[PDB]
Amino acid sequence: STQSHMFDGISLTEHQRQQMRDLMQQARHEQPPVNVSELETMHRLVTAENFDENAVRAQAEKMANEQIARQVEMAKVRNQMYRLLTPEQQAVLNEKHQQRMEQLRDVTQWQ
Amino acid sequence: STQSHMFDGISLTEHQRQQMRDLMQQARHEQPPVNVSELETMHRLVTAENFDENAVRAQAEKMANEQIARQVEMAKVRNQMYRLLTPEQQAVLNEKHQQRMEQLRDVTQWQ
């Protein structure tokens, strides 16, 4: 996947916005589509006559290596987009991230 | 996460729906909430003054191991749910899965 909240609500110059569009366009180009064959293999394990948790774990491990590759490459592109921002925009972005994380620690927001 | 399309559109008896609700509520109970501290660690890596791809990869590996544990446990629960279905319902479920995967191999559905 490529969707992120990281840059939500940041006010960009036109030049910043264009560069970020370009960076994301190429990141997408390089990220392969969903590995449908791995989904099918996992489905056939989950529906097997004899459920094989070892086989399931091995298949999850195999799938996670693709996920790691995506996460690393997207971290790189997002770092690059971050480096186009001014110190002031970076500070806004970091504050928004802090407030977003606080939602995951604030029980009253889920009651 | 716990959401899945696996059982979409399957007509269940009341006793099946009840058991599947119970199985999912327990699976949820056992699945810890989002590891906010690891999101924070990754965000600090992505916004570091000197971006460190090795550290990002190590962090993605760590997070991936948690994802593996979730996926294996969810596979077990989903196999248990599948085992409550009749052969007829299983055949419907498998045909629906096949049709869903075909969407990922059919360019005309995305044009």
User: CB distance B46–A75 less than 8 Å?
Assistant: yes
**From residue A56, how far is each of B1, B65, B68 by CA, in Å?**
17, 14, 10
Resolution of the experimental model in angstroms, please?
Answer: 1.5
Please answer whether residues A84 and A16 qualify as being in contact, where contact means their C-beta atoms are separated by less than 8 angstroms. Answer: yes
Q: What is the DSSP code string of B34-88?
A: P-HHHHHHHHHHHT-SS--HHHHHHHHHHHHHHHHHHHHHHHHHHHHHHTTS-HH
Q: What are phi and psi of A86, to 5 degrees?
A: -75, 160
Q: Give the integer Cα–Cα distance in Å for B78 and A44.
A: 12
Q: Look up residue A64 and give its two tokens.
A: 């996670």
Rounded (5°) CA angle A45-A31-B99: 40
User: CB distance A94–B47 less than 8 Å?
Assistant: yes
Residues ≥6 apart with Cβ < 8 Å to B56:
A72, A75, A76, B42, B45, B46
The residue of chain B nearest to residue A82, with distances taken between CA atoms, is B47
Tell me the domains of chain A and their CATH numbers. 1-111 (1.20.120.1490)
